[PDB]
């Protein structure tokens, strides 16, 4: 009835406590990323430190293949190296109160999607783009997380076989061309460096240079959008991530979308809940689960 | 309790009479091209004048989109050019038995699958490599269905963003690089001209100008069973088709798979059912249907 929310991701962790779909409480702080392995046993600790008490269950929502309680990194560029990591085991030490874990962005899913009409939507996908770029698939008005929870890894499905190597170690994934982190590591090295806030700055002036970095973006991510519709028939997809929030963006990727035959085209939106969902969802799927 | 199965395609049209999973009565007559959206009556007229009396119910197994007994054409020129066909009421002139209709290759899945250890693969895609690609995807132990019979196209998914253009419009599909009419379409066109399978030959040979045409198509299916295994948790693929049981070609599919990472691995086979599977497949499928 009272519930202890975790968003583990890249760059940050969020914490809050959940009680009746509402958020209090809420905390974050950086995540470790030099000797993670060890580096992460302690933050958690520290987590559960300051909210112990507070809480009857903990909802975990990280990146990563969450299946058993061990997070195993596809793209492990995005902890700093981190492969993998006891994540249940690690949350024993501290509570001995029932513990659920699942994706960052399945978790998203499902706070995106149980708001909508479960009627005229039942195979619905949330997309972000942000440090990574991942998903979360609803097929049938239900989260897809059989068997080990590899459901929804979206972003390492292929956007172009002559593209860059992906973290993961396989070529052209979506997200080696259309990430926070491809955006990145192409607009860093330029001259001056630019962050990839900075180089939107530019594209938004009309930058050709810039223009490039963005349009190949936005492109893989409306074919990615394009592949879900003409494969799942996904019939509503929602877009977020500190790059599908972008001013200028979503709209990019839409005009791709409609370019192409009107059997590749659905209702693409903006996420209504933005760096909250993830904590949001992953507490109503751990509810779900208890019955 | 017995049962017309058809199996309408680009090439050929196959009927049988399906009675407790066998097949009897096996015809096969060529699918017609020229004045399709009338040619197709008559031959299907034709079809169950011959069949009359020794059927109880029809099972329905061919290309395109098919929802509510309407046959719309993804890429048409699998079809001489026929964008859509009223293929539920045409079969009505004939008999007021009742209808089934799917996929060809949704139902050949069906075929393919109801051997398979249900406990051991319940994330389940058979592929065809044909005149044109698809797939039929089983999910849960479950033919992915709704809710307009879209799920499955996965031969108009992305291979290559500067690939060539599709019949469906989009640039760069699965088909328009891997199937048997792309290939075709590049081996026609030598001099002197070549069938696929005569490309097949030389690539045997190791022709490097055959063996590129059919590396260019073995790589783009590697790549969406990679595709299907990283965003779906595929657990087994099957692929069949004049191209996939291709002697040579599932072997150097496999030697792509397994350049990539692991978290892209999977059981990839030969599918047992050849030309059959799309007549058994639909006959199960509008049995499973009326209980
Ligand atoms: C560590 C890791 O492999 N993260 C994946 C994926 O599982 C995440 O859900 C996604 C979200 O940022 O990005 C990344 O692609
Ligand atoms: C007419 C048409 O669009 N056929 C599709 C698809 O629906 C078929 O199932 C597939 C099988 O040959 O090829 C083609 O990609
Ligand atoms: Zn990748
Ligand atoms: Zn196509």
Same mark, same amino acid.
């Given at each position: 009835?009272?519930?202890?929310?975790?968003?583990? /991701?890249?760059?940050?962790?969020?914490?809050?406590?959940?009680?009746?779909? @509402?958020? *209090?409480?809420?905390?974050?702080?950086?995540?470790?990323?030099?000797?993670?392995?060890?580096?992460?046993?302690?933050?958690?600790? $520290? +987590?559960?430190?300051?909210?112990?008490?507070?809480?009857?269950?903990?909802?975990?929502?990280?990146?990563?293949?969450?299946?058993? /309680?061990?997070?195993?990194?596809?793209?492990? @560029?995005?902890?700093?190296?981190?492969?993998?990591?006891?994540? @249940? *085991?690690?949350?024993?030490?501290?509570?001995?109160?029932? +513990?659920?874990?699942?994706? =960052?962005?399945?978790?998203?899913?499902?706070? *995106?999607?149980?708001?909508?009409?479960? $009627?005229?939507?039942? $195979?619905?996908?949330?997309?972000?783009?942000?440090?990574?770029?991942?998903?979360?698939?609803?097929?049938?008005?239900?989260?897809?997380?059989?068997?080990?929870?590899?459901?929804?890894?979206?972003?390492h499905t292929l956007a172009d076989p002559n593209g860059p190597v992906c973290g993961c170690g396989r070529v052209g994934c979506?997200?080696?061309?259309?990430?926070?982190?491809?955006?990145?590591?192409?607009?860093?090295?330029? $001259?001056?460096?630019?962050?990839? @806030?900075?180089?939107?700055?530019?594209?938004?002036?009309? =930058?050709?240079?810039?223009?490039a970095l963005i349009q190949r973006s936005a492109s893989a991510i409306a074919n990615l959008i394009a592949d879900l519709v003409?494969?799942? =028939?996904?019939?509503?997809?929602?877009?977020?991530?500190?790059?599908?929030?972008?001013? /200028?963006?979503?709209?990019?990727?839409?005009?791709?979308?409609?370019?192409?035959?009107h059997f590749y085209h659905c209702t693409v939106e903006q996420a209504r809940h933005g760096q909250d969902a993830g904590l949001?969802?992953?507490?109503?799927?751990?509810?779900?689960?208890?019955?």
């Amino acid at each position: 009835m009272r519930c202890l929310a975790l968003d583990i /991701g890249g760059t940050k962790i969020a914490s809050a406590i959940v009680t009746d779909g @509402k958020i *209090e409480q809420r905390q974050q702080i950086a995540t470790p990323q030099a000797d993670a392995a060890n580096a992460m046993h302690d933050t958690l600790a $520290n +987590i559960l430190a300051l909210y112990a008490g507070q809480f009857d269950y903990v909802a975990v929502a990280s990146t990563g293949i969450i299946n058993h /309680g061990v997070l195993t990194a596809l793209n492990p @560029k995005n902890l700093g190296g981190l492969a993998e990591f006891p994540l @249940k *085991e690690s949350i024993a030490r501290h509570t001995d109160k029932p +513990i659920g874990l699942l994706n =960052d962005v399945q978790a998203a899913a499902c706070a *995106e999607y149980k708001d909508e009409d479960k $009627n005229a939507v039942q $195979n619905f996908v949330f997309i972000t783009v942000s440090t990574g770029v991942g998903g979360g698939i609803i097929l049938e008005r239900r989260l897809l997380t059989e068997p080990n929870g590899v459901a929804g890894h979206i972003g390492h499905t292929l956007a172009d076989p002559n593209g860059p190597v992906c973290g993961c170690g396989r070529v052209g994934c979506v997200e080696a061309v259309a990430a926070g982190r491809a955006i990145e590591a192409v607009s860093s090295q330029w $001259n001056p460096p630019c962050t990839p @806030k900075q180089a939107f700055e530019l594209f938004r002036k009309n =930058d050709e240079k810039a223009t490039a970095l963005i349009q190949r973006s936005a492109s893989a991510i409306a074919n990615l959008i394009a592949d879900l519709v003409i494969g799942l =028939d996904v019939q509503k997809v929602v877009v977020g991530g500190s790059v599908g929030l972008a001013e /200028g963006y979503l709209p990019l990727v839409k005009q791709y979308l409609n370019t192409m035959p009107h059997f590749y085209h659905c209702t693409v939106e903006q996420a209504r809940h933005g760096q909250d969902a993830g904590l949001l969802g992953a507490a109503w799927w751990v509810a779900d689960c208890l019955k």
